[PDB]
RNA sequence: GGAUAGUGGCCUACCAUGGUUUCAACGGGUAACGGGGAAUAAGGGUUCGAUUCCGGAGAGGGAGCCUGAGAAACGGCUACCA
RNA sequence: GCGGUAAUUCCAGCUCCAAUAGCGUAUAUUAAAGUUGUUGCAGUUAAAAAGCUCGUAGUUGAACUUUGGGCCCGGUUGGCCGGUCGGAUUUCCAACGGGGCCUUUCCUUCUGGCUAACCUUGAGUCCUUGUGGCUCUUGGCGAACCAGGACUUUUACUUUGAAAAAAUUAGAGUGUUCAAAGCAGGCGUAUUGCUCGAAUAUAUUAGCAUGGAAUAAUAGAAUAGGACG
RNA sequence: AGGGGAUCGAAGAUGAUCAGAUACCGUCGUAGUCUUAACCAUAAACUAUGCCGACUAGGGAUCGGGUGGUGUUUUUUUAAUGACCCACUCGGCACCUUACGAGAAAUCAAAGUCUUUGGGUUCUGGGGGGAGUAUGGUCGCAAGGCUGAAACUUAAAGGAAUUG
C-alpha cells in the first residue's frame, strides 16, 4: 500500500481474486477427456456441464448439472487438456 | 452508465494523489486518454504508464510523482474561440506563469499553449496543474 | 445495471484471451458447422446449440473455431427463425404471464410484471426494427401473440 | 404526384411556343423542349424521356433557379406535385453558452422527372414565388428510399 | 523562484517529504525527519555523518510512515529483503 | 451532477426553468404582473395629489405609546382614498379639510414606516407650497 | 383565367384534401413601434431604448378616390361616425 | 431603536462632521446578490426529492479503423558575434512554428491547355583543394488552375477572409488658456504660400468565402440487388 | 351493492371523577372491523436523504450463490450424502472503529472526491404570515384529489449546538 507493483501482481493474490478482477479477464473452469471403463474411448466434458452430457455409444450417464461444477458419475476418471 | 471514459480516468489520477499514492490503474483507457495523460507527462505531472492490453478497451497503469495538485475534466466539450481560450485559463488555473489548460482542436489534442503558438482552436476538455 | 430491478448483480462469463486455438482441439472448421446445422436441424436455438456443443463436444466457442457466430452460420444455411430468439423467448413469456393473469384477475402482482416484460419487448422490437432485421411496423399485440409462438 | 392521364384537366397541356406542325409527318408527336438548370445540377432523363408537362419544372419549365440552394429531409409528400421537407437546425444561446434543437418545414415544389418519397433527402433551389408558400423547387434527390428494398419475406 | 535578474527572491524552499514529494510545511508539526547512521568497519557508527530521510505528516497519520520508510531505506541498500514491490 | 442539465444542447431546458424559476423572486413578479399600475394607490408613479377629507389620530404600535397624526387623502387621479403621515412636530396645523396635499411614499417600498400602522405614505407639500417651508418660515400658506 | 406595374389563393371557376403543432402551434397579455444603441464597470450578466441617425406606421376614427412619375396623400377631395 | 424629569436620538442655542454650487426626499432600476446560480446556489434536521415502478417527448450515451519512422524547403523571434558610417545581413547555435515528399497511402475524374518545379543536362564554372552557385536549350514532375465533359454520402466545431453607415464605444494625432468638446491645425518670405491630418479597433448570431480533419454525429457490403474492368 | 357480522369498537347512551368534564377511567353498543364486485388515491406512504456510472478506508458478524480442503462429526466396511469448521470470492440486510474528507453543527463510507467550483440525467425550494386560502380547470357518488394565485400584513419566523 501506496507504492505497489499493479503491472506484476502476486500469483498468489492474482489467483484468489474474482474471474473478472484479475488483472487481465479470463475463465476459471476448464474442459477434460473422460471415460467410464465400460467403454475404451474418451468423451471431452466441460467442467461446468448444464447438460446431463450424454455420453458417446452406451448412454449410460457421466455428469449431472449443479450449481456450477458438473458432478461426475460413479467410476470414471479424467485429465484438465 | 458510463458516460465519459476521460472523467473517470482524471478523477481516479486525483484520488491517488490526493491519498498519497504512487500509482493508478485506469479502466477503460481511449485514444483521448492516451493524449491526454500523453500531454500531462509532457510537462511532469505523472511518471510513465503502460497500456495493459485485456482484448477489450484496455486499461492503463499510471505513475504519479506528487507534483501534481489537481487534473480536472470539463463535461461538455464547450466550443472556445481563439478569443475565448483567456477567459478559460483565467477560470480555473492557478496564475498566469504556470498550469495548462488542455482542449481538442482540429489539429491534435494540445495544452493552450500549443494551441496558442500554433493559432488554433476547437473544443475544450480537461486541464492539469 | 438490470433494467428492470434494482439488481446490481456483476456476473458474466469471462472469455479467455486467446482468440483462437486450443490447439489441444482437434476436429476443424468443417467439423463443427456441419454440426451446428444438425443441431438447429433438429430445431435447438442458438444458444441451445452453444451450450450442447460446449459441454458434450470441445467447442470453446464456436466463433473462435469457425470465424462466425452460431446465428450467423444458421442464417446463411437457410435457418433463422423469423424473430430473433431472444425477442421470441420475451413474447413466450408475456404469453404465459397474460394466460395466468386471465385466470387470475385478483393477482395485481402479475399484472404488474406483465407491463415490464412487454415493455421489455416494445423496446427489444424498436431495436431490431430500427435496424432492419424487423420489418418497419411489426409489432407485439397481445391479441396476435400467442399465435406468432404456439 | 402526377401520374397517368397527362391530358387530364379542361385545358390543353402544352409547352408554350413549342409547336409540332401536323404536315410534317414526325416520329415523336410531340417536339420537348427542356434546358440546363445550371450550378452543375444535372437535369434527369425522366424530364426529356417524359411528357408530363407542369410549367414548373425546372427542367421542362418555365422558371430560374436562383437564390438559396438548400437541401432538406422530406416529411410530406401527401400534396400533389408539391412537398415539404424540414430543414433542422441547432440554435446557439450565449447566456448559457449551448444549443437546443430547432427546426423549420418548408414548402417546396416537386418536377414528376423525381419521383420522391417520406425520409427522402433532397436539395432544393430557390425561385419566383411558385403558390402561396412555396419558394423551393427540388433539384436532386441525395437519398434513395433508405434501404426499403432489403425488407422482403423470411429466409 | 528567481527573478527578473537572477536574484532569489522570496524566502524559504521548503524540505519535501521523501515519501510524497509534497511540501512540508511549518504548521506541519506532526511531520518527521529521521536519521539513519552511516556505519564503518566491524560495527562503529560514524557520529554526525547520517543518511536521512524526511515524511510529511499526512503521511504518517494514515499509518504509511513504517512501510515507506522500509522501501525507502531499504533501496537505498540499508535493508536486506524486508520490503516487496509486489503484492 | 446534482439537478441541473450539463449537456451542450440542453440549452432550451436550461433557460425554461430559469423562466419558471424567476416568478419566485418577489420583485421578478411585481414587475411582470404590472402590480404597480393595477394595485398601489398611485400610478406606479413617484408621488400623487390627493384631496383631504378628514385629519386623523393614529395611535402608535408598541412598545411606543403616541399619536401620530395623520391625514385622509382621496387621490385625483383615481378616487382611491388613502390615509397619510404629517411630519414634524405641528404642522397638522397647517393643512385643514378639502385642501390639496402632495403625497409621497415613505421609502420601503410599499411597506408601512414605524409605528405608525396602516400608513404608507407622507404629506410633501400642502396648499401649493411645501409642508417643510412652512414649518421653517421660508414661506406662508395661500389665501384660499 | 381574370385582375396587377408585375410574381402569388391576390381574386374567380373546376378539382383535390391538405397546411401548423411539446423543437410550444393556435389563443391571451404587453403601462411593445423595431434597430443603431443607454445605464450598471472582475468576468458571466441584469435592466432600458416615446426620444437628435436608419427603417416602419399615422395625421380625431374608419373606408373611398381624384391628380400624378410617385399618394390609397389628409396643412387633397368624397361619404359615414364622433 | 429613542421619549414615562439628570433625553448622547425629540424642540432649540452652542460647538462638531460629510459632500459643497449644490445637497435632501419619493419612485424606478443596476451593483452589493453565489438571495435565480451557464460561469455559480440550495433541498437528512433551516424553504425544497413526486408513495411507488413503467414509460413517450427531451437531454445523455463504453472501447476500436493512418499510426510510427525517413527525407526536403523556406519562414520568425532571440542569442554570441557587426560588416557599418541608432540597425543591418551571411554563416555558428539553439526554440517555436508553416509547407511539401517517400514509406502498400485519391489528389473526384478523364480529354489539352500552363507548365513552376528536377531524377534531368547541355556546355562549363565567378571562385575558399568543391555539389558552397545562377544564368542556361533537345529525351524526362503535374495538379498551381485554366474550360468542356463525366460525378460527387451527410453535418456540427474551429480557423482566416470578404461584405459591411454614420453618431455612440475603445482608442492615435492636435496644447479648445484648462477641460467637457471639436476635427482641427501647423509652418514661413506673415507682400500675392508652404504643409501633417481628418487613423485604428469592435462590429459576436445568421448568410457568404477559405484552411484544418482532433472531438461528436451521419451514410456504406449480409437473402449480396455488392466493388472495380 | 351483496354476504358476513365472534371480536374489538368513531357515534350515541350511561357509572363515576371535576368548579365544570361534552373527555381521560368503567358499562351498553350503531357504523366499522372480515369478504366479493366496484370506487377513493391519501399517511411522519420516513432512511424526513432521486436514479445510473467511477473513485476514495479499516474490522469482526450474518443471509443467498460458488470454489478450494489426504478439515471435524454422522459408521457400516470405508466411502456417497447431510449438518458443522477454516480460507477466498461475488451479490444482500445491517453493525463496529476511524477519518484522509465533508458540515452551521448534530453527524456523515456518503451527507466524501466543491472558490483547486463541470461524469449523465430527473424533480423541488428562494424571508415569515396571508394559505394550500380565493379563482378557473379537471377527476370523484360523496368525502375529497390534482393543478393553484393575489391584495394586505410583518423583522423576523427557523436550524444545530452551549450555558443556565
Ligand atoms: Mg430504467
Ligand atoms: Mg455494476
Ligand atoms: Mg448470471
Ligand atoms: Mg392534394
Ligand atoms: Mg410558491
Ligand atoms: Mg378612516
Ligand atoms: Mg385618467
Ligand atoms: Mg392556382
Ligand atoms: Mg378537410
Ligand atoms: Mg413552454
Ligand atoms: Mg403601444
Ligand atoms: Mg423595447
Ligand atoms: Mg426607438
Ligand atoms: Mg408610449
Ligand atoms: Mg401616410
Ligand atoms: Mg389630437
Ligand atoms: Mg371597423
Ligand atoms: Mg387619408
Ligand atoms: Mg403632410
Ligand atoms: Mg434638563
Ligand atoms: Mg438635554
Ligand atoms: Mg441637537
Ligand atoms: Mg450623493
Ligand atoms: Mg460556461
Ligand atoms: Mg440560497
Ligand atoms: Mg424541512
Ligand atoms: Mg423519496
Ligand atoms: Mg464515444
Ligand atoms: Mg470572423
Ligand atoms: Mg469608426
Ligand atoms: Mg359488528
Ligand atoms: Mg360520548
Ligand atoms: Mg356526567
Ligand atoms: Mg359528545
Ligand atoms: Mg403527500
Ligand atoms: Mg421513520
Ligand atoms: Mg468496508
Ligand atoms: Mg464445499
Ligand atoms: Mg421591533
Ligand atoms: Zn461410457
Redesign the interface.
Known amino acids: 500500500?501506496?507504492?505497489?507493483?499493479?503491472?506484476?501482481?502476486?500469483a498468489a493474490?492474482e489467483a484468489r481474486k474474482h474471474?473478472?478482477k484479475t488483472?487481465?479477464?479470463?475463465?476459471?473452469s476448464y474442459?477434460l477427456d473422460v471415460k467410464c471403463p465400460g467403454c475404451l474411448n474418451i468423451?471431452?466434458?466441460?467442467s461446468h456441464?448444464?447438460?446431463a452430457?450424454?455420453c458417446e455409444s452406451c448412454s449410460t450417464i457421466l455428469c449431472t448439472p449443479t450449481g456450477g461444477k458438473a458432478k461426475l458419475s460413479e467410476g470414471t476418471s479424467f485429465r484438465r487438456? | 452508465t458510463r458516460s465519459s471514459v476521460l472523467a473517470d480516468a482524471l478523477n481516479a489520477i486525483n484520488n491517488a494523489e490526493k491519498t498519497?499514492?504512487?500509482?493508478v490503474?485506469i479502466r477503460p483507457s481511449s485514444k483521448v486518454i492516451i493524449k491526454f495523460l500523453q500531454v500531462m507527462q509532457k510537462h511532469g505531472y505523472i511518471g510513465e504508464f503502460?497500456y495493459?492490453?485485456?482484448?477489450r478497451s484496455g486499461?492503463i497503469?499510471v505513475q504519479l510523482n506528487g507534483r501534481l495538485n489537481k487534473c480536472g475534466v470539463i463535461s461538455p466539450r464547450f466550443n472556445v474561440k481563439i478569443g475565448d481560450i483567456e477567459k478559460w485559463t483565467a477560470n480555473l488555473l492557478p496564475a498566469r506563469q504556470f498550469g495548462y489548460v488542455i482542449l481538442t482542436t482540429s489539429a491534435g489534442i494540445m495544452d493552450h499553449e500549443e494551441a496558442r503558438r500554433k493559432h488554433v482552436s476547437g473544443k475544450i476538455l480537461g486541464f492539469v496543474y | 445495471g438490470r433494467m428492470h430491478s434494482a439488481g446490481k448483480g456483476?456476473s458474466?462469463?469471462?472469455?479467455?484471451?486467446s482468440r483462437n486455438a486450443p490447439a489441444?482441439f482437434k476436429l476443424s472448421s468443417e467439423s463443427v458447422i456441419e454440426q451446428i446445422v444438425k443441431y438447429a436441424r433438429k430445431g435447438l436455438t442458438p444458444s441451445q446449440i452453444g451450450?450442447?456443443l460446449?459441454?458434450?463436444?470441445?467447442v470453446?466457442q464456436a466463433r473462435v473455431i469457425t470465424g462466425n457466430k452460431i446465428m450467423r452460420i444458421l442464417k446463411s444455411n437457410g435457418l433463422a427463425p423469423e424473430i430473433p430468439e431472444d425477442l421470441y423467448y420475451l413474447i413466450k413469456k408475456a404469453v404465459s404471464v397474460r394466460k395466468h393473469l386471465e385466470r387470475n384477475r385478483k393477482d395485481k402482482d402479475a399484472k404488474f410484471r406483465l407491463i415490464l416484460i412487454e415493455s421489455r419487448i416494445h423496446r427489444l422490437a424498436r431495436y431490431y426494427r430500427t435496424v432492419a432485421v424487423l420489418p418497419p411496423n411489426w409489432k407485439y399485440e397481445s391479441a396476435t401473440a400467442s399465435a406468432l409462438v404456439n | 404526384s402526377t401520374e397517368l392521364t397527362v391530358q387530364s384537366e379542361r385545358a390543353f397541356q402544352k409547352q408554350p411556343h413549342i409547336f409540332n406542325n401536323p404536315k410534317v409527318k414526325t416520329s415523336k408527336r410531340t417536339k420537348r423542349w427542356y434546358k440546363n438548370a445550371g450550378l452543375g445540377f444535372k437535369t434527369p432523363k425522366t424530364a426529356i424521356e417524359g411528357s408530363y408537362i407542369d410549367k414548373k419544372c425546372p427542367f421542362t419549365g418555365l422558371v430560374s433557379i436562383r437564390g438559396k440552394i438548400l437541401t432538406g429531409t422530406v416529411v410530406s409528400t401527401k400534396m400533389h406535385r408539391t412537398i415539404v421537407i424540414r430543414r433542422a437546425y441547432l440554435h446557439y444561446i450565449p447566456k448559457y453558452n449551448r444549443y437546443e434543437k430547432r427546426h423549420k418545414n418548408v414548402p417546396v415544389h416537386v418536377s414528376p422527372a423525381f419521383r420522391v418519397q417520406v425520409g427522402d433527402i433532397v436539395t432544393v433551389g430557390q425561385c419566383r414565388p411558385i403558390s402561396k408558400t412555396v419558394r423551393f423547387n427540388v433539384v436532386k434527390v441525395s437519398a434513395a428510399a433508405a434501404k426499403a428494398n432489403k425488407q422482403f419475406a423470411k429466409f | 523562484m528567481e527573478n527578473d535578474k537572477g536574484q532569489l527572491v522570496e524566502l524559504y524552499v521548503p524540505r519535501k517529504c521523501s515519501?510524497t514529494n509534497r511540501i512540508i510545511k511549518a504548521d506541519d508539526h506532526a511531520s518527521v525527519q529521521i536519521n539513519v547512521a552511516k556505519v564503518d568497519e566491524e560495527g562503529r557508527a560514524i557520529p554526525g555523518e547520517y543518511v536521512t530521510y524526511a515524511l510529511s505528516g499526512y503521511?504518517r497519520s494514515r499509518g504509511?510512515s513504517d512501510?515507506?520508510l522500509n522501501?525507502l531505506a531499504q533501496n537505498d541498500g540499508l535493508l536486506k529483503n524486508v520490503w516487496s514491490?509486489?503484492? | 451532477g446534482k439537478g441541473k442539465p450539463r449537456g451542450l444542447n440542453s440549452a432550451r431546458k436550461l433557460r425554461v426553468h430559469r423562466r419558471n424559476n424567476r416568478w419566485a423572486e418577489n420583485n421578478y413578479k411585481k414587475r411582470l404582473l404590472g402590480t404597480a399600475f393595477k394595485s398601489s394607490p398611485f400610478g406606479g408613479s413617484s408621488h400623487a395629489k390627493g384631496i383631504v377629507l378628514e385629519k386623523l389620530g393614529i395611535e402608535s404600535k408598541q412598545p411606543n405609546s403616541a399619536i401620530r397624526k395623520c391625514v385622509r387623502v382621496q387621490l385625483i387621479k383615481n378616487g382611491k382614498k388613502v390615509t397619510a403621515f404629517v411630519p414634524n412636530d405641528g404642522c397638522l396645523n397647517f393643512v385643514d379639510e378639502n385642501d390639496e396635499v402632495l403625497l409621497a411614499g415613505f421609502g420601503r417600498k410599499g411597506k408601512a414606516k414605524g409605528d405608525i400602522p396602516g400608513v404608507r405614505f407622507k404629506v410633501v407639500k400642502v396648499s401649493g407650497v411645501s409642508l417643510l417651508a412652512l414649518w421653517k418660515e421660508k414661506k406662508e400658506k395661500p389665501r384660499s
Do not use: N
Request: proline content about 4%; aromatic content about 8%.
Open positions: 500500500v501506496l507504492v505497489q507493483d499493479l503491472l506484476h501482481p502476486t493474490s474471474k473478472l488483472l487481465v479477464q479470463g475463465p476459471r474442459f468423451t471431452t466434458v466441460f456441464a448444464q447438460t452430457v450424454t487438456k | 498519497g499514492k504512487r500509482q490503474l503502460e495493459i492490453d485485456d482484448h486499461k497503469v | 456483476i458474466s462469463s469471462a472469455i479467455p484471451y489441444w451450450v450442447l460446449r459441454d458434450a463436444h470441445g470453446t | 515519501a503521511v504509511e512501510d515507506s522501501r514491490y509486489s503484492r
